[PDB]
C-alpha cells in the first residue's frame with residue numbers, strides 16, 4: 001500500500017492510498033516509509049462490495065425464460081441468467097520500482113563501506129573523499145546543515161553527532177550496548193527547538 | 203445425389219497405402235474420405251454446399267468377399283464385403299443426426315450434437331441454467347437422417363452341405379435406404395460392427411455381443 005506524497009495534497013484533503021502489485025523481480029523493492037517511483041499500469045480489479053444500491057451488472061444475452069415451477073425469478077432467476085455485479089476498484093500493477101530521490105546515481109542493490117562506495121559514481125566519491133579529507137569538516141557540516149539558524153552552535157554539533165552515531169556492540173553475556181546517541185533540546189519559547197527537529201526531519 | 207462411389211481397384215492401383223488402410227480402420231478412413239470429397243466437390247461446385255453439405259463415399263469392388271457364415275470376431279471394425287438375400291426391411295425411419303435439445307427448465311436450445319451410431323447422445327448441463335435436469339429433443343431445430351434396418355441372409359444356393367442359412371442385420375443410412383427390397387439379392391459392403399448397446403449384460407446368458415453391418419455400399423444383382 002502506498003499513499004499520496006505530502007506535496008501532492010489538495011486543500012482540506014486526506015492523502016489518497018492505492019495498493020500496488022509487485023511481481024516477479026520487483027517483489028521486495030519498496031519498504032514501508034520509502035519514497036518510491038512506481039512504473040507500470042493502472043488496472044481495475046473486480047472487488048466484492050455493494051449495498052450502496054444495486055448497480056451495474058452482467059447477464060447473459062440469451063433470452064431464456066423459466067417454465068412454470070422454474071420461473072426465472074428471485075435467486076434462482078439471478079443464478080440462471082448468470083447475473084453478477086460489475087463492481088471494480090483501481091489498483092496499480094508495477095513492473096518496476098525505483099526510489100524517487102536516489103541517493104547515489106550509480107546503482108542500488110549487504111551494505112558494507114565498499115558496497116556503498118561502489119554504489120556511487122566517480123564524481124560522487126570524489127566529493128565524499130574530498131569532504132572526508134576536509135579539515136574543518138565539523139564546522140562545515142554544522143553550517144551547511146543549519147544555515148538559517150543563528151547561534152546555538154553546541155546544539156548543531158550535538159545533532160550532527162547524533163546523525164553520525166556511535167558503534168553498537170554485543171557483550172559475550174548477551175548484553176546489547178547502545179550505539180547511537182539521543183539528544184533532547186529543552187528551552188524557552190521560540191528558541192528554535194522545533195526548527196532543529198524540522199531541519200533533521202527534512 | 204450426395205454420394206460418391208469410389209472403385210477400390212482404382213484406389214488401390216493409384217494409391218495402395220490408403221487402400222490397405224481402408225479395410226482396417228474404415229470408420230476413420232471413410233470420415234476422412236467424406237471430408238475430402240466435400241472439399242473437392244465444393245471446389246468444383248461452390249453452390250453445392252446448400253444442397254447436401256455432406257458427401258458419402260461408397261467403396262466398390264472390394265476384394266474382401268466373405269460369406270455371412272464366415273464373419274468372426276477377427277472381422278470386427280473392418281470393412282467387409284458380403285452377399286445375400288434381403289429377407290426383411292423396416293420402413294425408412296428418421297434418426298437424429300444433429301440433435302438440438304430443449305432445456306425444459308429454462309427453454310434454452312442446446313446446440314447441435316452429432317448422433318453417433320454407437321450410443322445415445324445425452325447432454326450434461328444446460329449451458330445457461332446449468333441444470334442437469336430433463337431435456338427433450340427440439341424436433342424443429344434438429345436435423346434427421348434416413349435410417350433403415352435390413353436383414354440379409356445367405357442365398358439358399360450358396361448354403362449347400364445341409365445346414366442352415368445365416369443372417370445379419372445391416373443398417374442403411376441416408377442414401378442407401380430403399381435401395382434393397384425383401385427378396386433382392388445384393389452385395390453388401392460395410393463395417394462389421396460390435397459396439398453400440400447390445401452386449402447381453404443382463405445375465406440372460408453368456409456375455410455375447412450382437413453384431414451389425416453398417417452398410418457402406420449396396421449393389422443389387424439384377425437388371426434395372
Ligand SMILES: Nc1ncnc2c1ncn2[C@@H]1O[C@H](COP(=O)(O)OP(=O)(O)O)[C@@H](O)[C@H]1O
Pocket residue numbers: 148149150151152187188189190191192193194195196
Ligand atoms: N538563532 C535563533 N534563535 C531563536 N529563534 C530563531 C533563531 N533562528 C531562527 N529563529 C526563529 O524562531 C522561530 C521560532 O522557532 P520554533 O522552533 O518554532 O519555536 P520553539 O523553539 O518554541 O519550538 C522560528 O521560526 C525560527 O526561524
Ligand SMILES: [Mg+2]
Pocket residue numbers: 193194
Ligand atoms: Mg516547538
Ligand SMILES: [Zn+2]
Pocket residue numbers: 305306307308309310328329330331332333
Ligand atoms: Zn436451462
